[PDB]
């Protein structure tokens, strides 16, 4: 019968509690017992905080108001505060050490996914403390996983008010057996289970957990690590620039902080990074997610010419200079990482800080056609059957969710060899029709490809193929060149054509090159191991990148 979850903040999501920094004052400066508690609550509903509750007064008009009871209540016990006793100070503490509770964010979470109406409901205040910014972080993270959230300072209502509970329930549209209400505060518990909901009082989240699980009977404790949060398209603010006529580059951007520039590979998407935007940006970063000329919202020209390595650098130059960015960290992966290492060879003014997954830096040949060097290595056969301008389109385009389903497959589900294609006659023809779904892939992600590449197709996705003689004549110009701005390599044990050992040399380009390895990868980095391409990446921004 239960359909909808409540929590509160203070001691429930996010710990330690603030509202615990008054005992624990009270014993640090031994004050006598609950003086500053009694302060705090002085008046009841006619005084200073509920005020502040209810969003008469903000936070910084109620300082001097908590502070004036503080000494009201050391007078009538008859005992003196300290010399520089600071309510703000105190305040600034408590709210910068408390934290989300991440357990109960995960069960929140879990209840989400099983289909509950999630909500929070909180006493809160209108902060406008020079400090703010801290809390204001804390609340986007947490907001964006609920239905609902309900503060007290916005609605003028407060627990344990009667009217802020049959708000709450008009809000979820729900009856009141239908919903479980957690609480750390008995007496803002009590006008819920007066109503008839389950309620929860929280003390440690272990036992608040136990009887959550019980009450709605699903799995919430000891379960497995969950997937980093991921990207819904429609909730993502979507950039667009045009670099020359006829030709405009779309992102997704998320963030504030340095800009981080996410360049996928071949047949992707922005959406490829859908477990790391997130992530990046929560970690202080301003993530923009390309998709690459030639593919989704982004222009895509049929000339071959126009997806060779140097036209490709330069409009990210000018992609740049359009933003008003003079730099940006660069990431790639696949045919974006091969890019990034030439934006860091040719353009290091504007590239702050360098990584590639999978995609080592292996410096041109100037004695051997890149061809010759391409036909050596079995595992490049797909390469040369991507040469033949209509060939690869033609098969690729005919079922795009056969396409996107044989093609994103986790490295022990594989039904596509890169190697013996040209002789086979395709890349799919010993494939089934109607491949299993990969465990890296849901249906309604593959049907987001599928409709990214519907409006192109795979011209402009295969031209990064077809420009290898013109790419090398480029790329030996930089011949007498090294990397010296930060670069990271990440490796993946289990990419069979991008294999960790063809990376082995790259310090003598790259000296100071920084590394990664994820092992049981396969070439689809970002979503075969999110948590782990998360770890690496912002470890290495965090140390180089800032
Ligand atoms: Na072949």
Redesign the pocket.
């Known amino acids: 019968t239960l359909r909808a979850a409540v929590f509160d903040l203070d001691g429930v999501l996010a710990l330690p509690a603030v509202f615990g920094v008054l005992g624990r004052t009270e014993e640090a400066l031994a004050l006598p017992r609950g003086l500053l508690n009694d302060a705090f609550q002085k008046g009841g509903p006619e005084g200073a905080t509920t005020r502040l509750m209810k969003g008469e007064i903000t936070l910084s008009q109620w300082i001097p108001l908590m502070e004036e009871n503080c000494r009201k209540c050391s007078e009538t016990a008859k005992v003196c505060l300290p010399k520089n006793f600071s309510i703000k100070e105190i305040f600034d503490k408590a709210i910068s050490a408390r934290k989300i509770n991440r357990p109960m964010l995960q069960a929140a979470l879990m209840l989400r996914k099983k289909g509950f109406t999630t909500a929070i409901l909180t006493n809160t205040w209108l902060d406008d403390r020079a400090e703010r910014d801290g809390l204001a972080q804390l609340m986007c993270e947490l907001k964006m996983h609920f239905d609902f959230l309900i503060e007290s300072c916005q609605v003028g209502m407060v627990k344990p008010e009667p009217q802020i509970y049959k708000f709450l329930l008009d809000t979820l549209k729900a009856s009141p057996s239908e919903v479980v209400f957690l609480d750390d505060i008995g007496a803002n518990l009590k006008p819920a289970r007066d109503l008839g909901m389950v309620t929860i009082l929280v003390q440690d989240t272990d036992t608040a957990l136990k009887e959550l699980e019980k009450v709605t009977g699903i799995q919430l404790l000891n379960t497995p690590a969950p997937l980093p949060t991921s990207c819904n398209p429609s909730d993502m603010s979507h950039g667009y620039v045009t670099v020359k006529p006829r030709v405009r580059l779309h992102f997704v951007e998320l963030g504030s902080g340095p800009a981080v520039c996410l360049c996928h590979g071949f047949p992707e998407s922005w959406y490829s990074w859908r477990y790391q935007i997130p992530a990046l940006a929560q970690a202080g970063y301003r993530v923009l997610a390309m998709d690459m000329k030639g593919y989704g919202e982004s222009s895509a020209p049929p000339e071959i010419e126009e997806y060779c390595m140097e036209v490709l650098c330069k409009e990210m130059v000018t992609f740049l200079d359009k933003l008003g960015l003079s730099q940006a960290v660069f990431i790639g992966h696949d045919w974006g990482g091969m890019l990034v290492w030439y934006m860091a060879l040719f353009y290091p003014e504007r590239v702050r800080a360098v990584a590639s997954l999978n995609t080592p830096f292996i410096p041109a040949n100037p004695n051997m056609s890149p061809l010759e060097s391409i036909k050596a290595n079995p595992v490049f056969?797909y390469q040369?059957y991507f040469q033949e301008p209509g060939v690869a389109e033609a098969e690729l385009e005919q079922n795009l969710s056969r396409t996107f389903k044989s093609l994103f497959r986790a490295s022990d589900e594989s039904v596509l060899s890169m190697?013996?294609?040209?002789?086979?006659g395709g890349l799919f023809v010993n494939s089934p029709e109607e491949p299993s779904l990969s465990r890296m892939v849901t249906e309604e992600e593959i049907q987001f490809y599928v409709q990214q590449f519907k409006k192109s197709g795979f011209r402009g996705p295969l031209n990064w193929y077809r420009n290898m003689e013109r790419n090398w004549k480029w790329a030996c110009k930089s011949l007498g060149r090294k990397i010296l701005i930060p670069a990271l390599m990440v490796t993946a044990e289990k990419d069979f054509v991008l294999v960790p050992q063809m990376s082995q040399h790259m310090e003598d380009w790259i000296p100071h090159l920084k590394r990664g390895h994820i092992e049981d990868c396969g070439h689809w980095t970002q979503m075969d191991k999110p948590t782990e391409v998360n770890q690496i990446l912002i470890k290495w921004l965090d140390s180089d990148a800032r």
Not at 419 to 424: L, S
């Open positions: 056969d040369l190697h013996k294609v040209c002789e086979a």
